[PDB]
Design a protein around this nucleic acid. Structure first.
Ligand SMILES: [Mg+2]
Length: 102
RNA sequence: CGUCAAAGCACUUUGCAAAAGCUAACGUAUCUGUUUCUUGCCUUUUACCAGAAACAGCCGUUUGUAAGGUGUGCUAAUUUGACUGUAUAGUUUUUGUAAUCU
């Protein structure tokens, strides 16, 4: 769209918001939502998260289900913990990498 | 304008209660009477004359409250009150200079 001017009112701001998804990088969230693809999360405390993604916010606030979360740290020993459902604040997201289900 | 709360609401009839507290129009209006004094005209009384003080009456006004009436509603309408009431990932607070060890 020809409105990245960043000086907008509410309706065109919402249009730009939806375009920020429909073609922006956050577009990866939609096809991950609709294709039910595996997505891995890198948190800012060196945490590894992999799970289904169901909904996301523009802030990258994400609701996850069936999360497998692993962390490593004596001698370096990797450990894992599976939790049913997650609400992760997009503040702490560093990286997302998708594992295609197919 | 917004949110929350409780009250049906608008208009109206009647009863009860109150109306200066920090000197100030309950009424931006305005009458009558009684008692006690001082006066005026006076043959005596009422009826009077015009000033004061202390008291009352009448014509009115405002507010609170209680029970009703009319017209509209409760499948919503209006009124009253309270409120620390609004955006915003791009340096001054809320979308992380973090983890790492000590
Ligand atoms: Mg005689």
């Amino acid at each position: 769209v020809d409105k990245p001017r960043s000086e907008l009112s509410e309706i065109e701001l919402a249009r730009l918001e939806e375009y920020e998804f429909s073609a922006g990088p956050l577009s990866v969230l939609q096809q991950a939502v609709k294709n039910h693809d595996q997505v891995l999360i890198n948190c800012r405390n060196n945490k590894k998260l992999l799970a289904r993604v169901k909904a996301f916010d523009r802030h990258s606030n994400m609701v996850l289900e069936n999360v497998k979360e692993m962390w490593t740290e004596g001698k370096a020993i990797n450990k894992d913990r599976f939790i049913s459902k997650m609400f992760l604040r997009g503040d702490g997201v560093v990286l997302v990498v998708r594992i295609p289900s197919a």
